[PDB]
Structure 1
Amino acid sequence: MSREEVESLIQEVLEVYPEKARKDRNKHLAVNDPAVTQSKKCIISNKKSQPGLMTIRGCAYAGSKGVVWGPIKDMIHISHGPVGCGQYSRAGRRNYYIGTTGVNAFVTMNFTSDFQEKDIVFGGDKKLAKLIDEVETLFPLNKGISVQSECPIGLIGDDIESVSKVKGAELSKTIVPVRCEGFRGVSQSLGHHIANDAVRDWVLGKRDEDTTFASTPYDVAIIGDYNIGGDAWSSRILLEEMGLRCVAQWSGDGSISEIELTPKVKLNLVHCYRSMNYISRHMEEKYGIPWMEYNFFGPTKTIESLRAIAAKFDESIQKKCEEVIAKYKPEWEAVVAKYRPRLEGKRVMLYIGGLRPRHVIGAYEDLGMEVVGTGYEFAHNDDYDRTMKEMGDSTLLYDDVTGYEFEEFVKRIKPDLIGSGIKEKFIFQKMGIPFREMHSWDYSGPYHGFDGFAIFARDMDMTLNNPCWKKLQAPWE
C-alpha cells in the first residue's frame, strides 16, 4: 500500500469516533517516514487514553510492581491496598528466576494488605506496620520489602513512607515505599519512572561508602532485561563468553545485592531503554558509569550488539567476541536455512508495550519477514524516534491503539502474522490471522541471543504455517 492509501485508511477508521476522540486519535496514528528523526513531527505519544475506547494500556502499578520490582526475587513485594491488583498480577509475567519460592525467593507469590472498608475509612498505616512484622516472622530469609501502592493508598492520605522509615529502622531492613497508584500517569510508563526513582532513593546508594567489592575492568550490569522465559540468561551467557563479568541483572532473576553492587560496574548494558533509562542516567551522572543500549533479538542485532559492547573494552574482549560470533555462526545459520524458506516474504504487524515493537524487527527480518505495522501502548516520543529508522517506508505506526482501530487496520492490511498481547490474541485468531504473544513469548522462549533465535524461528514457523489457519471456512460455506 502506498502512503496515500495508508493515510486514507487511517481517516476511514477515524471517521467512526466522536469529534473529540477522532481529533485526539488522529495525532497518534502515522505513516512511517524512515528519514524523519524527530517523531514528534509525525506522531504523538505518552498522552492520556480516550475514555471508553477499549485501550490496551495498563496502570502505574503494573509498571512498577509487575515490571520493575516484582522480578526481584529475594525481596518481598506487598501489593498495598485491596485484593484485586495483586491477584490479577500474580505470576502473570514470566520473569524467570532461580530460587526456593516462599523461603528465599518470592516472585510468584502474592503478598497484599487486602484492604477492607475499615482500612479505607480509618487508614491502613497501622495495618501496614503489622503486616511488615508478620512478613518478618513468616519469611525470615527475605532480604527486603517493597510496598507497591494501589489506587486507594494515595486517595485516603496514607503515609507509607513514614511507616517504611520507622519499620525499616526498627528491623534493620530495607523497606521501599513505592507510590505507584494506578491512577497516576497514563500507563505503565510512569510506573517504570516511579519504580526507578524508588530504586535510586532507597536501594541503589546503600553501598556508596562500601569499598570491599573487588571490581574488574570487565564489570557490566544488564539493565532492563526482565528474563522473560530466560531471555536475560540467554543474554548473560553471551556476555560471559565474551570475557565480561555480569555483576547485576535488572531485574529478571535480580537480587537486591546485585542492584546494590551495580554502582560498582564499568558499563551499564540497557536492553529496555523505556523502563530503565531514568536509573541509567542517574547512575551515569552520580557514579560516572557509561550506559549503552543493546539488542539481542536475532543473530544480526546480537552480533552488532556484541561488537559494539566489546568495542568498549580492550582488544582481548574484542578477540573473545569474535570467537563467540564464530562459535555461534553455524547454529543460527542452520536455523536460518531451516526456517527462512518457510517464512520468506511473510508480513507482520506488531503492537507491544514500550521496547519490543522496534526491537524485534531485526529478528523478523533475519527470517525474511517484513514488519508492515508497529505500535506502542506507552512509549514516549524518544522511543518513536528510534522506530522510524527501523521500519519500512509507508508502514503503519500506531500509539495506544484502540481495539477497534487495530482490528480495522488488520482487516484492511491483512498481515500474515500479528504480535501483541493476550488481550488481542483471540480476537485476531478468530479472524484467522496467525498470532504470537510478544509479551510472554506465548509461554515459550527465550528469544534473546543465538539460543533464543532458534526458539523464535521455530515458534514463528509453527504458528504462521500451522494447518489450523487453513480450516476456518467450512467446506459447505
Structure 2
Amino acid sequence: MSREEVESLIQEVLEVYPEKARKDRNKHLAVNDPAVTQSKKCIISNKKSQPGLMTIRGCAYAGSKGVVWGPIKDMIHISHGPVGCGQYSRAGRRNYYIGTTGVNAFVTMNFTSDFQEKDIVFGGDKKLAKLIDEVETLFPLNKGISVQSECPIGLIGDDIESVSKVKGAELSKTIVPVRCEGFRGVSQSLGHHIANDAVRDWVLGKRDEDTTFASTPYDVAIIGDYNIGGDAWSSRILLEEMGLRCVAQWSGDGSISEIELTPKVKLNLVHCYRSMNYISRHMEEKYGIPWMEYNFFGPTKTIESLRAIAAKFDESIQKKCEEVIAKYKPEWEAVVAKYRPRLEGKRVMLYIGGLRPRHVIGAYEDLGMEVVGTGYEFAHNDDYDRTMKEMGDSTLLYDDVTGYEFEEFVKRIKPDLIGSGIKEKFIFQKMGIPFREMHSWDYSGPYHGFDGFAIFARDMDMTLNNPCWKKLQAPWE
C-alpha cells in the first residue's frame, strides 16, 4: 500500500475528531520512512492521551507494581490504597517464578491495605505500619517489602517513605516505598522509571561494600526481562550455554538478592530498553558496567544478538556461541520448514507496549511474514528511532492509538493478523481478523530464544489458519 494511500488513510480516519483532538492525534500517526533516523521529525510520542478516546494505556502503578516490582518473588508487594487496583492486577501478568506461594514467594497474591473512608480522610500511614507488622507476623520468610502507591496515596499526603524507613530500621528489613500513583505521568512508562529509581535508591546499593560474592569475567545480568510465560528462562538457558554466568534476572523470577548482586556483573544485557534503560545507565555510570541492548525474538535476531554478546568477551565465549548456534540451527530451521509456507507473506498489525512493537518484527519476518502497521502504547522518541529501521517502507506507525483509530486502520488495511492486548482481542476477533495476544502470549509461550520461537511459530500458525475464521459470515447472508 502506497505512502500516499497511507496519508489519505490517516486523514480519512482523523476527520471524525473535533479540531483539537484531530490536531493532537495527527502528530501521533505517521508513514514509516526507513531512511530517516530521527523520530521528532516524523512522529510524536510519550504524550498525554486525548480524553474520552478510549486509550489502551495503563497507569504508573501498572508500570511499577504490575511490571517491574511485582515479578520479584521473595518480596511482598503491598498495593497501598483501595482494593481495586491490587485486585485487578492480581496475577494478571504471567511473570513466571519458582517458589512456595504464601511461604517464600508471593507474586500471585494480593496484599493490600484495602483503604476505607476513614483511611482516606485520616491517612493510612499507621495502618501501613500495622499492615507491615502483620505481614512480618504471618509471612516471616519474606525477604523484603515494597509499597506500591495508588492514586489516593499521592492525593491525600501519605508519607509512605517515612513509614518504610522507620519500619525497615525497626525490623531490619528492606522496605521500598514506590510513588507510582496512577495519575503520575501519562502511561505505564513513568511507572517503569519510578520503579527503576526505587530499585536504585532502596535495594541496589546494599552490597556496594560487600565483596564476598565470587565474581568472574563471565558475569552478566539480564535487565528488563519479566519471564512472561518463562521468557527470561528461555533466554538465560542460551546465555549460560554460551559459557556465561547469569548472576541476576530483572525482574521475572527475580529475587531481591539477585538485584543486590547485579553491580558485580561484567555485562548488562538489556532486553526491554524501555523499562530498564534507566537502571542500566545508572549502573554504567556509578559502577562502570557496560550495557547493550539485545534481542532474542526469532532465530535470526537471537543468533545476531548471541554473536554480539559473545563479541564482548574472550575467544572461549565466541567459540561457545558458535557451538550453541550450530546446535540450535537445526531446531529453528525445522520450525521454519514446518511453519513458513503456512504464514509466508502475511501482513500483521501490531499494537503492544514499549518494546515488543519493534523487537518482534524479525521474529515475524523469519517466518516470511510482513508487518504493515505497528504502534506503541507508551513509547518515547528513542523507541521510535529504533523502530524506523526495523519497519519496512510505507508502513503505518501509531502512537497511543485510539480504539476508533485502531478500528479504522484495521478496517482499511485489512491485516491478516493483529497483535495487541486483551482490550482489543475480542473487538478484532468479532471482525474475523485472527488475533494474537502479544502481552501474555495468549497464555502460551515463552517466545524468547529458539524454544520460544518454536512456540511463537506454532501459536501464529494455530491462530492465523484456524478454521473458525472461515465461519463468521452465515451462509444465508
Identify the TM-score tier after normalising by the shorter chain: over 0.9
Task: Report the Cα distance in structure 2 between the residues aligned to 1:358 and 1:2, rounded to whole angstroms.
Answer: 21
* Cα shift at 1:311: 0.3
Write the deviation string for residues 10-45 of structure 1: whole angstroms up to 9, x where unpaired: 000000000000100000000000111111101000
Q: Classify the secondary structure of the residue corresponding to 1:206.
A: helix
* Cα shift at 1:250: 0.2
Write the deviation string for residues 140-187 of structure 1: whole angstroms up to 9, x where unpaired: 000000000000001111100000010000000000000000000000
Write the deviation string for residues 224-274 of structure 1: whole angstroms up to 9, x where unpaired: 000000000000000100000000000000000000000000000000000
* Cα shift at 1:415: 0.4
Write the deviation string for residues 47-92 of structure 1: whole angstroms up to 9, x where unpaired: 0000000000000000000000000000000000000000000000
Task: Report the Cα distance in structure 2 between the residues aligned to 1:424 and 1:154, rounded to whole angstroms.
Answer: 31
Q: Which runs of 4+ in 1 moved over 3 A?
A: none
Task: Report the Cα distance in structure 2 between the residues aligned to 1:267 and 1:52, rounded to whole angstroms.
Answer: 44
* Cα shift at 1:380: 0.2
Q: Classify the secondary structure of the residue corresponding to 1:55.
A: coil
2:101 counterpart of 1:124: no
* Cα shift at 1:391: 0.4
Write the deviation string for residues 297-348 of structure 1: whole angstroms up to 9, x where unpaired: 0000000000000000000000000000000001110000000001101110
RMSD: 0.4
Q: Classify the secondary structure of the residue corresponding to 2:177.
A: strand
Task: Report the Cα distance in structure 1 between the residues aligned to 2:252 and 2:111, rounded to whole angstroms.
Answer: 19
Write the deviation string for residues 122-153 of structure 1: whole angstroms up to 9, x where unpaired: 11100000000000000000000000000000
Q: Classify the secondary structure of the residue corresponding to 2:306.
A: helix
Task: Report the Cα distance in structure 2 between the residues aligned to 1:267 and 1:434, rounded to whole angstroms.
Answer: 40
* Cα shift at 1:198: 0.3
Task: Report the Cα distance in structure 2 between the residues aligned to 1:446 and 1:155, rounded to whole angstroms.
Answer: 39
- When normalised by structure 2's length, the TM-score is 1.00
Task: Report the Cα distance in structure 2 between the residues aligned to 1:4 and 1:247, rounded to whole angstroms.
Answer: 50
1:230 corresponds to which residue?
230
Task: Report the Cα distance in structure 2 between the residues aligned to 1:75 and 1:18, rounded to whole angstroms.
Answer: 47
Write the deviation string for residues 405-453 of structure 1: whole angstroms up to 9, x where unpaired: 0000000000000000000000000000000000000000000000111
* Cα shift at 1:194: 0.3
Q: Classify the secondary structure of the residue corresponding to 2:108.
A: coil
Write the deviation string for residues 185-216 of structure 1: whole angstroms up to 9, x where unpaired: 00000000000000000000000100110000
Write the deviation string for residues 85-136 of structure 1: whole angstroms up to 9, x where unpaired: 0000000000000000000000000000000000000111000000000000
1:412 corresponds to which residue?
412
Task: Report the Cα distance in structure 1 between the residues aligned to 2:112 and 2:359, rounded to whole angstroms.
Answer: 34
Task: Report the Cα distance in structure 2 between the residues aligned to 1:472 and 1:368, rounded to whole angstroms.
Answer: 27
- When normalised by structure 1's length, the TM-score is 1.00
* Cα shift at 1:404: 0.2
Task: Report the Cα distance in structure 2 between the residues aligned to 1:61 and 1:357, rounded to whole angstroms.
Answer: 22
Task: Report the Cα distance in structure 1 between the residues aligned to 2:186 and 2:139, rounded to whole angstroms.
Answer: 35
* Cα shift at 1:360: 0.6
Task: Report the Cα distance in structure 2 between the residues aligned to 1:97 and 1:362, rounded to whole angstroms.
Answer: 27
Task: Report the Cα distance in structure 1 between the residues aligned to 2:471 and 2:161, rounded to whole angstroms.
Answer: 57
Matches within 5 A, 1:201-350: 201-350=201-350
Task: Report the Cα distance in structure 1 between the residues aligned to 2:140 and 2:7, rounded to whole angstroms.
Answer: 60
**How many residue pairs end up in the alignment?**
477
Task: Report the Cα distance in structure 2 between the residues aligned to 1:359 and 1:183, rounded to whole angstroms.
Answer: 29
Task: Report the Cα distance in structure 1 between the residues aligned to 2:429 and 2:141, rounded to whole angstroms.
Answer: 45
| Unmatched 5+ stretches in structure 1 | none
* Cα shift at 1:277: 0.5
Task: Report the Cα distance in structure 2 between the residues aligned to 1:83 and 1:415, rounded to whole angstroms.
Answer: 39
Task: Report the Cα distance in structure 1 between the residues aligned to 2:148 and 2:123, rounded to whole angstroms.
Answer: 16
Task: Report the Cα distance in structure 2 between the residues aligned to 1:81 and 1:475, rounded to whole angstroms.
Answer: 53
